[PDB]
Amino acid sequence: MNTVPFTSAPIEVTIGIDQYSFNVKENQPFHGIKDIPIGHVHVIHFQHADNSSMRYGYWFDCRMGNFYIQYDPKDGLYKMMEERDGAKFENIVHNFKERQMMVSYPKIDEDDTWYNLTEFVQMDKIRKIVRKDENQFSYVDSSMTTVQENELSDPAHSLNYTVINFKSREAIRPGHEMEDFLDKSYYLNTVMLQGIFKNSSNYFGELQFAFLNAMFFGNYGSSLQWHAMIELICSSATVPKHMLDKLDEILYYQIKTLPEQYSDILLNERVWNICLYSSFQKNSLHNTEKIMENKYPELL
Amino acid sequence: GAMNSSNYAELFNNDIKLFVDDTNVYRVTVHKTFEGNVATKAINGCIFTLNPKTGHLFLKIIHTSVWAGQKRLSQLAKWKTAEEVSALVRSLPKEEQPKQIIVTRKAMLDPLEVHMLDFPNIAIRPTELRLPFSAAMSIDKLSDVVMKATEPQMVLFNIYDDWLDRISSYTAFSRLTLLLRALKTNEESAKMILLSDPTITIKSYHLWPSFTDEQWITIESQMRDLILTEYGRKYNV
Numbered sequence: 151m152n153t154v155p156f157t158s159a160p161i162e163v164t165i166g167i168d169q170y171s172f173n174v175k176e177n178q179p180f181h182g183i184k185d186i187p188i189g190h191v192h193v194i195h196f197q198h199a200d201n202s203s204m205r206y207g208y209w210f211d212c213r214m215g216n217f218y219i220q221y222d223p224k225d226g227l228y229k230m231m232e233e234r235d236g237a238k239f240e241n242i243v244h245n246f247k248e249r250q251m252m253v254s255y256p257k258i259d260e261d262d263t264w265y266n267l268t269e270f271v272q273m274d275k276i277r278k279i280v281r282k283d284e285n286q287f288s289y290v291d292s293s294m295t296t297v298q299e300n301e302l303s304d305p306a307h308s309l310n311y312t313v314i315n316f317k318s319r320e321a322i323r324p325g326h327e328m329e330d331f332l333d334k335s336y337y338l339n340t341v342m343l344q345g346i347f348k349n350s351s352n353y354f355g356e357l358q359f360a361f362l363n364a365m366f367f368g369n370y371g372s373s374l375q376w377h378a379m380i381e382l383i384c385s386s387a388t389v390p391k392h393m394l395d396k397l398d399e400i401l402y403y404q405i406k407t408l409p410e411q412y413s414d415i416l417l418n419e420r421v422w423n424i425c426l427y428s429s430f431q432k433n434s435l436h437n438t439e440k441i442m443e444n445k446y447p448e449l450l
Numbered sequence: 451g452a453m454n455s456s457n458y459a460e461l462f463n464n465d466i467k468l469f470v471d472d473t474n475v476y477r478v479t480v481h482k483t484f485e486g487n488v489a490t491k492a493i494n495g496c497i498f499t500l501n502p503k504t505g506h507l508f509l510k511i512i513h514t515s516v517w518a519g520q521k522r523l524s525q526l527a528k529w530k531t532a533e534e535v536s537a538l539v540r541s542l543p544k545e546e547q548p549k550q551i552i553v554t555r556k557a558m559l560d561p562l563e564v565h566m567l568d569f570p571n572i573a574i575r576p577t578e579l580r581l582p583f584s585a586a587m588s589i590d591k592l593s594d595v596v597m598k599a600t601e602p603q604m605v606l607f608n609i610y611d612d613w614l615d616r617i618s619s620y621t622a623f624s625r626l627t628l629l630l631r632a633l634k635t636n637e638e639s640a641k642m643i644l645l646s647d648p649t650i651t652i653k654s655y656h657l658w659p660s661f662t663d664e665q666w667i668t669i670e671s672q673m674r675d676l677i678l679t680e681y682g683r684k685y686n687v
Contacts, residue, residue: 317560319567327564328529 152212153243153252154194155182156228157220162199163228166207166366168192168264169407172253173199181251182219184243188212190268191276194219195366196228205367206291211273214286218242230287266403267362270354279310279359290363296371309363309371312346312356314378316385333430335388342382350393353379354400361404364416377421384429394434401438405445413446422449453552453577462503462619467550470535471498471583472558474596475512476527492517494596497531498586499538501548503619505610505626509586510534511596511603532561538604539569552577581627588633588640591657611656616663625670629658632673635680643672 154167159180164173167183174180176199186192195207208230210217215232216239222229233239246252257264273286280288296309315321321337322330330336347353357379363372383389383397408416426432426439427450442450453461461467475497478490492514499508512530520526539547550573551566553559563574587593595605610622617625632640650659661669681687 317563317567322564322567324568327533328526328561331560331564 151184151255152186152188153182153184153247154186155218155242155246155252156180157218160221160223161226164197164199166193166195167255169267170256179251180253181246181249182253183255184247184252185254185257186212187255187257187264190265191271191273193362193366194230204292206289207366208287208289209273209276209280210287214273217287230285230289232286263403263407266399267407268358269400270351271358271362272355275352275355276359279356281306281308281310290367290369292367292369294367294369294371296375299371299374309369309375311360311371311375312342314342314375314382316382333385333387334382335386338382338386339388350390350396354396358400358404365404365408365412368415373416373418377418380425381421381429384425384431384435387430389431389434394431397431398435398437401435402441405438405441410445413449417446417449419449426450451575453575453579455578459620462623464503465549466546467502467552468508468535468548469498469500469502469552469554469577469581469583470531470558470562471500471554471581471586472528472531473554473584474498474587475531476517476523477587492523494599496586496592496596497534498583499535500583500609502623505608505614505619505622507607507609508538509592509595509605509607510538511599511605513599513602516602528558528561529565531558532565535562536565536568539566539572548572550575554581554583582630582634585630585634585637588630588637589657591652607657609657611653611658625666628670628673628677632676635677639676640673643669643676 159174159178160176162174162176164171165183167186183194191209191211193207193209195205197205204227206227208217210230215234216236217230218233218239219228220231221227233242273288276288277283280290282288290309294307294309295303296311297305298311298313298315300308301313313320316331316334316337320341321334323336326336343350343353347356357376360372360375360379363369364376380397380401383393422442426435426442475495477493477495479493480488480490483489494514495512497508497510497512499510500506512534516530517523517526535551539551547569549571551562552575553562554577556576559574559576566572566574587596592607595603609626610619613622613625629640629644632643644659650661650665652659
């Protein structure tokens with residue numbers, strides 16, 4: 151079990167840790183989060199009570215170091231920092247706990263939801279999409295644009311998602327215009343899986359990361375990327391059987407986790423109607439189709 | 451974006467633009483079979499690609515052989531159109547390449563954008579103009595060359611004949627659209643108006659009769675009358 155201590159909580163905030171959220175009041179004696187399962191990635195996110203503009207947070211892996219949160223009253227945000235002095239860190243987290251001013255990561259043992267949502271997400275891929283090599287953890291917020299979006303303006307503060315564009319030379323082999331536009335199998339299998347991702351695990355890792363950035367931060371460019379990576383698989387006549395069967399499980403848990411009152415802003419009606427009811431894989435997403443029909447029928 | 455009537459002039463500025471109409475690319479007759487079923491037979495079609503400033507018409511004849519053994523022909527027709535328009539643009543010197551292609555049917559947008567990926571500075575746009583280019587096959591000389599074709603074939607015309615010697619490109623386009631709208635609304639009566647005087651002829655190298663300026667005023671009047679008459683008949687007004 152790992153800990154993320156906080157120096158203090160000077161401003162009223164909603165704090166998320168993975169799929170859970172709690173409230174902290176202004177200058178409440180809060181000193182962070184204990185009892186965090188190791189192994190995965192995690193995300194710790196913030197939305198200020200006094201200004202719900204800019205949600206932001208940090209992706210991290212407790213195995214890569216000792217992380218803490220300290221509010222910066224100049225920049226006006228909770229900042230993640232690494233404690234390089236392990237003895238000092240062990241001294242704080244053995245004591246603040248002995249104080250009991252920390253909230254417990256509340257993992258139900260039947261509940262494997264966070265593992266299902268991050269199965270393919272890896273910190274090393276996250277640090278390629280979010281470029282800040284001096285930190286072991288990666289900052290994302292509501293407003294960050296994607297490299298693709300910047301192509302249609304500060305590259306340091308951008309989400310370096312794999313560019314997917316169905317009407318680009320990369321997607322369309324000269325001489326195969328109709329074939330490749332109607333059946334994106336070439337673009338999926340040769341360009342994206344063989345060429346760029348190298349395997350379906352890295353593909354799914356980016357798709358899962360994009361979904362979580364869309365859900366946790368309301369990051370629009372992340373939602374576009376999530377939808378694009380679903381549509382590319384569904385619009386291909388030729389997809390390995392294992393990938394379709396895994397895609398059904400990935401999407402089911404994402405739909406299951408999505409806040410009920412967030413369906414208007416996080417689901418693209420066009421993409422979901424196409425994938426579930428028109429696409430080559432319309433009959434390949436049984437579990438996803440069933441939860442969407444029963445949970446979000448208004449969209450379809 | 452989608453062309454209309456505020457910017458109706460922009461059409462006739464110095465930026466080269468082409469209208470693409472695909473309504474006559476895939477054409478069929480619908481007839482009864484021996485089993486008492488109904489069967490289509492394809493007949494030759496054409497892509498109508500027009501420079502509205504110059505009158506230059508690139509008529510790509512679509513021979514029925516293109517459909518042989520193909521499925522979903524109405525879908526294929528949009529992609530065939532896009533292929534041939536792209537090929538036409540590639541065949542032109544850079545200084546003659548259009549800066550805009552305006553498709554008369556929004557269904558042409560994705561096929562044309564995909565075939566034109568090599569030309570990222572050529573804007574592919576729909577229009578809010580309801581243009582009567584479907585009636586191109588009512589022009590006898592265009593219909594004759596399409597129906598006689600035994601192979602794929604590109605034929606060049608000036609759809610304004612010599613009008614630009616005497617009127618603006620705006621005025622010539624307005625005359626063309628009136629004539630085509632009349633031929634679309636009542637083809638036989640529109641042809642009667644044009645061919646009523648056997649003393650006014652069509653030059654070997656023209657599509658339309660050699661009307662004087664005054665005769666064109668009278669012809670345009672008779673075409674407006676034909677359209678209004680047909681409106682009254684359809685809506686009992």
